[PDB]
């Protein structure tokens, strides 16, 4: 139980456009589609204002206990609503129950996370398809970066893939969670200082590209998490994947430049990757 009434009228009124009524949402607690640390993702059914059934994903957030966490939850709801972009996940809304825990209502992503999609043997993406997925991620990050938003957790498992094989940058705001660590996707300066910028997201994006070109191989499998900073300070980097073209491996290496100023912007990455994308032939997705 959490008291909706005695929160903060000015804040609560600012949230109203994000709020969903509990009557207007069905959550299928029997059908789990994802596991995080802060909560699981379920199949839900939303009813929009004209009364049409929309198939959605619903994340619970157990641990959102005190008024601080509940207030911060609403603010993240506000932030997410103001983002609109084809390669960025959108928030449908939030549902504060009378008795139960708060619920994050999200669009259903038919083909799940990008890492599990590429890892699955049933799926057969071409080299062009994989470059295309990376290009889509870059466009989302270009949008977020233009809104002065730092992700801090960009990785292939944290991007989702919809019915039309459109990649959505996900795992931010209310959808932030450890899904089923991030040290191996962190920029060298972030490992030492714990300070995150758009240029640290560029590093992480580089590793995400390596994930795509390996079809979801775990990075640095033989390097222990504690000595990763030392590995990178010796200049050691992820090797070129078997079916990764040279010009795209050059892109990855530029993302892993130790000085952050010298890394490309996401704007630059969209240009460079779309140029590389325009030399390949043949797409399954
Ligand atoms: C075989 N399998 C049957 C079920 C099918 C449908 O599954 C779906 C799973 N998840 C969603 C969903 C949509 C929007 C937002 C979120 C929350 N969120 N989750 C993840 C996430 C989910 C599951 C596993 C992993 C990992 N590792 C990561 C990452 C970022 C993020 O923001 C989830 N939609 C559908 C897929 C095929």
Residue numbers in the entry: 1052 to 1231, 1245 to 1349
Original paper wording:
The receptor tyrosine kinase MET is activated by hepatocyte growth factor binding, followed by phosphorylation of the intracellular kinase domain (KD) mainly within the activation loop (A-loop) on Y1234 and Y1235. Dysregulation of MET can lead to both tumor growth and metastatic progression of cancer cells. Tepotinib is a highly selective, potent type Ib MET inhibitor and approved for treatment of non–small cell lung cancer harboring METex14 skipping alterations.
Unfortunately, no cocrystals of autophosphorylated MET WT protein with tepotinib could be obtained. Therefore, we generated a phosphomimetic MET Y1234E/Y1235E mutant expressed from insect cells as a surrogate protein for structural studies. Accordingly, Y1234E/Y1235E thermal shifts for tepotinib were also identical to the 2P form. Although the A-loop was disordered between K1232 and K1244, electron density for Y1230 was still defined indicating π–stacking interactions with tepotinib identical to the WT structure. The Y1234E/Y1235E structure was obtained by soaking into apo crystals and solved in a different SG (F222) but again no crystal packing interactions are found for A-loop residues. This is further supported by the crystal structure of the phosphomimetic Y1234E/Y1235E mutant, which showed a partly disordered A-loop indicating enhanced protein flexibility but still with identical π-contacts between Y1230 and tepotinib. Accordingly, the Y1235E/Y1234E mutant showed reduced residence time and thermal stability for tepotinib binding in comparison to the unphosphorylated WT. Tepotinib showed tight binding affinities to both the WT KD and solubilized full-length receptor, while the phosphomimetic mutants (KD and full-length) indicated reduced affinities.
